[PDB]
Every structure is written in C-alpha cells, then in structure tokens.
Amino acid sequence: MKVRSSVKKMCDNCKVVRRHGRVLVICSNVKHKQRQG
Amino acid sequence: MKGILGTKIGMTQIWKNDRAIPVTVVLAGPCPIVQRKTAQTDGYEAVQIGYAPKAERKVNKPMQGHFAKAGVAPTRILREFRGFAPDGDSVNVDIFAEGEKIDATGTSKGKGTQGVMKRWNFAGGPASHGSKKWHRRPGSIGQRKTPGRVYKGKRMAGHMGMERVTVQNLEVVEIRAGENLILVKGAIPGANGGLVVLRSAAKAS
Amino acid sequence: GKQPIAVPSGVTVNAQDGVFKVKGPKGELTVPYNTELTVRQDGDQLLVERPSDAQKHRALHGLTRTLVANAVKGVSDGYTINLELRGVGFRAKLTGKALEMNIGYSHPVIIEPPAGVTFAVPEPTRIDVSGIDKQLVGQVAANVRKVRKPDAYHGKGVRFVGEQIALKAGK
Amino acid sequence: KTYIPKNDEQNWVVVDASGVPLGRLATLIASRIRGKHRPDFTPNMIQGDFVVVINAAQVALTGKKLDDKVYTRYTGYQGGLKTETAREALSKHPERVIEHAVFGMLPKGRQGRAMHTRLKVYAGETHPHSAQKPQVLKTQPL
RNA sequence: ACCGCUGAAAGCAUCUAAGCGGGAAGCCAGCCCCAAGAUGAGUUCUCCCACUGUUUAUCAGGUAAGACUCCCGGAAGACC
RNA sequence: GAUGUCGGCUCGUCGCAUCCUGGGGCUGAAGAAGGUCCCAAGGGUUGGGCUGUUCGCCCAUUAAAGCGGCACGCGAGCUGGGUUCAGAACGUCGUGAGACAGUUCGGUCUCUAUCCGCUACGGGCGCAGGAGAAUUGAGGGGAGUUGCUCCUAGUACGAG
RNA sequence: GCGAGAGCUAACUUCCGUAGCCGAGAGGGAAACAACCCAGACCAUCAGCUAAGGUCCCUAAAUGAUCGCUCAGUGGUUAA
Ligand SMILES: [Mg+2]
Ligand SMILES: [Mg+2]
Ligand SMILES: [Mg+2]
Ligand SMILES: [Mg+2]
Ligand SMILES: [Mg+2]
Numbered sequence A: 001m002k003v004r005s006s007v008k009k010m011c012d013n014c015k016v017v018r019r020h021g022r023v024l025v026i027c028s029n030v031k032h033k034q035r036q037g
Numbered sequence B: 001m002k003g004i005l006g007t008k009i010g011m012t013q014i015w016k017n018d019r020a021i022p023v024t025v026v027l028a029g030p031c032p033i034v035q036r037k038t039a040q041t042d043g044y045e046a047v048q049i050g051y052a053p054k055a056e057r058k059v060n061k062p063m064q065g066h067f068a069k070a071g072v073a074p075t076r077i078l079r080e081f082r083g084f085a086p087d088g089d090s091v092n093v094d095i096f097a098e099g100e101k102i103d104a105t106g107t108s109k110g111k112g113t114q115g116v117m118k119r120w121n122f123a124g125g126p127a128s129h130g131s132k133k134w135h136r137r138p139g140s141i142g143q144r145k146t147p148g149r150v151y152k153g154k155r156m157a158g159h160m161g162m163e164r165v166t167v168q169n170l171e172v173v174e175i176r177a178g179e180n181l182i183l184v185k186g187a188i189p190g191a192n193g194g195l196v197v198l199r200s201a202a203k204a205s
Numbered sequence C: 001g002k003q004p005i006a007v008p009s010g011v012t013v014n015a016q017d018g019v020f021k022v023k024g025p026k027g028e029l030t031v032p033y034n035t036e037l038t039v040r041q042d043g044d045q046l047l048v049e050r051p052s053d054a055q056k057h058r059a060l061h062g063l064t065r066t067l068v069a070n071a072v073k074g075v076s077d078g079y080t081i082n083l084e085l086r087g088v089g090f091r092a093k094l095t096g097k098a099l100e101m102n103i104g105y106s107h108p109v110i111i112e113p114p115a116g117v118t119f120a121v122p123e124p125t126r127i128d129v130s131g132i133d134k135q136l137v138g139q140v141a142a143n144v145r146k147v148r149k150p151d152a153y154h155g156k157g158v159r160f161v162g163e164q165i166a167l168k169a170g171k
Numbered sequence D: 001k002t003y004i005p006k007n008d009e010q011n012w013v014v015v016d017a018s019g020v021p022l023g024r025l026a027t028l029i030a031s032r033i034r035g036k037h038r039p040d041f042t043p044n045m046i047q048g049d050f051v052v053v054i055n056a057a058q059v060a061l062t063g064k065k066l067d068d069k070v071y072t073r074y075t076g077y078q079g080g081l082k083t084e085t086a087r088e089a090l091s092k093h094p095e096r097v098i099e100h101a102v103f104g105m106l107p108k109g110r111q112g113r114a115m116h117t118r119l120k121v122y123a124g125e126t127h128p129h130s131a132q133k134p135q136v137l138k139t140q141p142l
Numbered sequence E: 001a002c003c004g005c006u007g008a009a010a011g012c013a014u015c016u017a018a019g020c021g022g023g024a025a026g027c028c029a030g031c032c033c034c035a036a037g038a039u040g041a042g043u044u045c046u047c048c049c050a051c052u053g054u055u056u057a058u059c060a061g062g063u064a065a066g067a068c069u070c071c072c073g074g075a076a077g078a079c080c
Numbered sequence F: 001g002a003u004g005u006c007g008g009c010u011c012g013u014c015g016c017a018u019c020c021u022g023g024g025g026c027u028g029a030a031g032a033a034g035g036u037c038c039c040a041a042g043g044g045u046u047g048g049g050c051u052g053u054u055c056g057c058c059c060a061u062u063a064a065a066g067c068g069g070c071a072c073g074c075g076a077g078c079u080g081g082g083u084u085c086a087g088a089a090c091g092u093c094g095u096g097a098g099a100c101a102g103u104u105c106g107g108u109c110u111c112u113a114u115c116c117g118c119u120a121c122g123g124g125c126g127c128a129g130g131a132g133a134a135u136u137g138a139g140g141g142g143a144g145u146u147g148c149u150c151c152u153a154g155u156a157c158g159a160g
Numbered sequence G: 001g002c003g004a005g006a007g008c009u010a011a012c013u014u015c016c017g018u019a020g021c022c023g024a025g026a027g028g029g030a031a032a033c034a035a036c037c038c039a040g041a042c043c044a045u046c047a048g049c050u051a052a053g054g055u056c057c058c059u060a061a062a063u064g065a066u067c068g069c070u071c072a073g074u075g076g077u078u079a080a
Helices: B061-068 B116-120 C056-076 C134-146 D022-034 D094-103 D110-118
Strands: B003-016 B019-027 B033-037 B046-050 B078-082 B101-107 B164-176 B181-185 B195-200 C012-014 C021-023 C038-040 C047-049 C079-086 C099-102 C109-111 C117-120 C126-131 C157-160 D012-016 D050-054 D119-121
Touching: B003 B046, B003 B164, B003 B181, B019 B164, B033 B061, C021 C056, C047 C056, C056 C134, C079 C134, C117 C134, C126 C134, C134 C157, D012 D022, D022 D050, D022 D094, D022 D110, D094 D110, D094 D119, D110 D119
Parallel strands: D012 D050, D050 D119
Antiparallel strands: B003 B019, B003 B195, B019 B181, B033 B046, B046 B078, B101 B164, B101 B195, B164 B181, C012 C021, C038 C047, C079 C126, C079 C157, C099 C109, C117 C126
C-alpha cells in the first residue's frame, strides 16, 4: 500500500482498472502497487 | 427463561471441600401459576407467577376475580417470566440445580440523596490547602461561552439506590426443596426480607 | 465482439419473459438477464442481439453472451475445479459431504458445500470441487484456496492443480 | 366578501406507494393533505383529505437506497447522541420513510403538526384495510 | 481498508461497469437499566354496573367497585 | 457605565492528522522482532524527583504512557505558586524625584441562583365510564480497556 | 465594481481616484442579511400589468415544450 496521489505508468506491465471511486493499479511487481486513497 | 420469585433471607459462611463460601440464603417459595400469556391472547409468550400469601380480607374484589379465574388463593406479589411455560405451579425442584450459574435480581438498598462523591465516585477537594469546597462538591459543571448549556446526563447529586440490579452468573451452591431454600455464592442486591428474582443465566459463559 | 452460441444435444432453452431459464440433463439451471437486450433462436445455434451500439450496451452484450455460454456448458459438460495441497503434512480427508483439511492450524478446518456443489478427494493432497453453476463453483473453490494461500517463500498451501508460484527466499 | 367555511366533510383517500419514487409520491400526499382542489379553499383551517398509504415497503428510490439516503435522528444532549439509519436500513420501520417525507413537505405550525394525524401509512397491500371501515376512494399518483 | 467469484466494454486480460461472497476493538442487534406526556397516550386479566334530581335550580346530589384522610411504623425518604 | 489573566486542582465532552489495543497492503517481509502506508475514535492512555511552571529533563513502570478543540475548556466551582497595586532590599539607570531587561522577601479571591441549562422529587390535567393489578418496547441511556502464563508446540520456519 | 500605491496581486486591512448605494432608503429578491440585483413609499381599495427574481411540496405561479449532455447527489467544499 503505497498511496501516491498521482497514479501514472512506470513500466510496460502496469494496469489502470477503475474501481470504487479512485485511480487504482494492478501491476506485475508487488512493490509497484499505486492507489489514491 | 427459567425463573423464580423469592425472599432474600441472609448471608452466612459455608464450607464445600476445604474452601469457605460466602452464601446468600434465599427462600424461593412456591409460586402458583396465575396467568399464562400467549401470542394468541396477549400478543407475546410469558407466565404470570405469584409469591407471598395474602389474608383473604386484605384482598380486593378486582384481585379476587383474577386469582379465582386460576383457582390460586391470593399471593401479594405477581411477576411475569417471559418464554417460560412448564405446567402445574413453579417451585425450585428441577427448576434449579446445584452448580447452575444464575442471574439474581433485586432492588438495591436505597440511600436517599447522595453527593457526587458517594454517588458518582467524584474526588471532591483538598481538606487543607485553603478550601471552602473541602471534600464533596463537584468541580466545574461545564465549559465557558460555548455550550451555554451543561451537558445532559451530567453526573450530579441525586437519589442513590432503590434501583433494579441484576447480578450475573451467581453459582448455585445448595438447594433444600421442601425446606424451599436455595443457597447462592456471593451477594444478591436488596436488603434481607426483600424480593429477589432468580432466573436462568441471561447469557451464560 | 461476441456472437455464436453452440447448443448441443438435450438442451431446453426457454428465454421467455425476464426469466431466461435453461434446462438440461446434468440439472435444471435458472439465470436472469437484461430485457432491453434481445435473445432467442435464429437458426441451428444461439445468438444475443444488442439494439444500441454506443458504450453501455456493448459491455452488457459480451456479458449476457458468455453467461448463457457458461450455463449451457454447465447443463451438458458440467464443471470441475482441481485444487492441489502443498506443504509438510498438509492433508485433506472427508466427513460426509464436508471437506476436512489439516493445514498447519491448531484445530482442523471443516467446509460444508452449498446445495448444488460436490467435494471430491482422490489422493489426500488433491481436492476436486465439481458442480452445476460455474459462479458457485468458482465462489466455493475460492473459499478453499483462502484457508491457506500459497506463501511467497515456500509456496505452501492450497493452489490450482497446474498453478505457477513465483518464489522470493529470505535467508 | 370572499367565501366562508364548511367542515362536516372528511374525505378518505387510498394511495399506493408501489414503484412510485418517494419524493414524487410525497408531493401528491402532502398536497391532498393541505388542500389541492380545496373544499371551501380557505387556509385559515384544515380542509385537506385523509390519506391512507399502502405498500409503504415497496416505495421506489433512485441512485441511493443503501448509499447516501441517510435519516439523521440526533437524540438528547449530544453526549455523542448522534444516531443515523441508511434508507435500506429502514427494513426496520418502512411506515416512517413515507411519514418523514410527507411531514417534511407540510407546514410546521400548530395546524401543520395537527396535519400528520391525517396520514395513515401501512406496509402491506390487501391487509391494511384497518383504518378502512369509512369511505376509501382510491387515487392513483400519475 | 483490503481479499476474492462469475465477467464484458477491449476476440485476451481485469474483484466492476450488471450481479455475487468474505472482511475490524468501529456500525446495527444482542447484555444491563429507563421507558405509552410513544397527546401516534398501546396490550391483557379482574371488578362495579347503567341510580337520582320541576318548562325555579341548565347538570349537580346520594352511591358501587375502589381509594383517600387520620393513627402506629418502615433495611422508603429532605418534603412529598 | 469592566468580557478576571498563567499554572495547579475538579469535572468533563469533542476532532483524528491514532500513542495502545482491532483489521489490512507493501517490505531490503524466512521465523521471532520490525519499518512504512491504508482502514479504524469503542475503550484505554501509570506513580514519583526538580521547577509557579505550561513545557522539558530525570527515576521507576507500562499494551500505551497520543496530538489538538472547547473564551490558550472550567475562579457566581476551589486554590493563588507565576504576573500587574501600596512596604522593603539588591544589581543596574537617572544630579534628582524616580525607573526596570531584572531579581528578591511580604501582601483582603465578595454567606442567600431570578430565567435558561443540569441532577433528583412531587402536584395537575390528559390518555371518551369509574376502578385494582400484570405488561409490549417506539424510543432512550449504561457498558465497551488490556497484560501475563500455559496448551497447541520446542511444531511451521531457520544452517544454527 | 473599476484604476493605482502600501500589504503577502492577505484582511470585513490601509490610503488616494472614480461610479453607485447605505449613511438619511421603506417596498420585492438574495433562507436569514446597511451595502449586491430590482425599485425611490401623498392617503384609501377583498381591482389590474410588470421588474429583479421565480413556477415539485413547505411557498405565489408550467411536475412546461424541443434537441442535447451528466449518474457523481456532481449539482449542493479549491489547487498542482
Ligand atoms: Mg478526598
Ligand atoms: Mg460478512
Ligand atoms: Mg490579562
Ligand atoms: Mg465562570
Ligand atoms: Mg492556482
């Protein structure tokens, strides 16, 4: 859980799927996890 | 669920093995069944039981009829016990068993008007370093200009005691039916010669 | 895009009203769907037709299609999930229809299946979750995989029969 | 000079909440309760009809039933005496959901308060015939 | 929060846009206490029973069932 | 034509940007111990020595010894140690009377609550006859903390 | 409000210029509300038209008509 108020691409593996009113991420590497709340 | 009416008799010292037990002697006398309450007639399921015998002369016509409709013979006390049915007329035999955890409820000995110290625990004040407010007197009842009010529910002096108190999970130590007696480990609320209500543990552990 | 729906042998589809009830040999399934989205037989096989071609309908199109494609598969082929137990002394038995697992927890884990799903154990380190409804089968085998998820150090716990597990290693 | 009063007329009305969106059903009730077509038409006193409501339980609500629609009853001195139910959470007392929308659209005076006495809400259909021994003329919303 | 199931848009993938399950000392219920001035004043059982009094006295007066007042007290209580 | 002012005490309640407990995600997460972020305000958050102290430093503990609001919460509730009256002394300044960036010893804190609000207790009338009892619970309030030890098991994990 | 200085291109700040209103201005509107919007009350009426604002119900008057957009309760707290 690394809450970065700006969820942008880092590598060619990142996936931006819209959920419960937020900008989330479901990347391959476990460290790469980004959320806005 | 299961329940009985009785009279707190007193407290004594008993031994079970080598351990001394503080016991509360209770007379859970015969309780005639006076009214059965059903969802069909009363809208809920319960039983009206009765406790101390009353001289026929002392009983009024409205109570005479109500007792006569069940062929009981005037009691003096009448209490309801919800979700309780068993037929006949309620005694402690097989109602209670040695070892059962019970919930004895009474009416606390009333202590009239009592200060915030005795009643709420408070702290009062210094006995010496210059008072006026020596021991009991509460502090500050509120804040300043904001809640121009004093909080509702504020802990203050009032009538202490003479209240309903249910003491949970009391152990059943001895039972002498026919002697119509039941020994309970610990202390039951209310004074000797007062009404107690022994019920099966409200939510047993 | 999604359009063809193969309906083999003893199929009894009755897409009448909002109750798109699909009966068959393995058991009779019932599944509700959208009314504004058209569905019936226009040949030998099956097809779901969408009126609006904007955005809201295109999502519901591929949804309704695949859902009856899964209910049809269910009434003839059926469904079976194959789970594998991994780790020292990790073993599963059976207590009726109930799955009794022993997975490094002080008190053994019991799971009771819902009305329509069945548990099976060939070797006691392999669990088979077979049922009629792919959702319910997914939702159940899901709970068994949850009893002990494969840890990121020794892959210990419940995994799918052919599942791949990446490993970290600390010491 | 304008027309005076007649009261010896209490009109009972049956309204069905089924599928009707709350606010929109509320408006109709609140209006028949005060005076829409109005008997003598005067505001000085209570001229409105009596409104019986059925199927209170089946009333409709848009984007939020479980979400946002929150009843906010805030109890005696606020020693955190701030109690709040959701609208889905009014699976407890549905007869209140209509009531609080209707009283909400009614005057708040002495007379206004005497107006809720004319609104009788019930959650069922064929059975609510309780307060239905007098007349019971049925009025559909729109 | 978070973890999943079935799953399109986006022939794949995705816990989500349809729907679904799990998940906190928190929320609602459960425990103890108050509670129908809940003027929306609720329910049940039992009792008494349908007196009498002029267009002068417009509803008062004997009464029932029942209670109160007074006395003697009280592990009730400032008074009540 | 006056809205008493630091600190103590007393009494509370509220926010969460959470100190402890509770649930999670990531970890440079083997385990044990942690770091960090997310959700979370239900309860809980110790006693002393120094100083008027708030603070802070220290002793000894702890699950923890949270941060802030409420007229820097609370003197018609208490204190009066700090500060800001009159006395007196020191250092400094002024020729002086005096003064202070100071320091020091001393120094009157006003029996009766009207309204609202709050705790307790009655009297009245209502609740479509007059009565004696037994009640359902709309609603409301109270409560809500946590250690250590054992078992599982010297097991999983670790070369240990 | 506009044009400037001072100020942090802060203040319901200060100080000039300029226009209006309040001061000394009632009436409608803006929930409430000197100033903003409309509008300047000689008195009477249980007559009529409008302005700013409005037309679900509280609350006067279209739950108007047409083509659209937004499903967040956005509308009904600001930014990189
Ligand atoms: Mg003391
Ligand atoms: Mg759950
Ligand atoms: Mg001051
Ligand atoms: Mg004061
Ligand atoms: Mg900017």
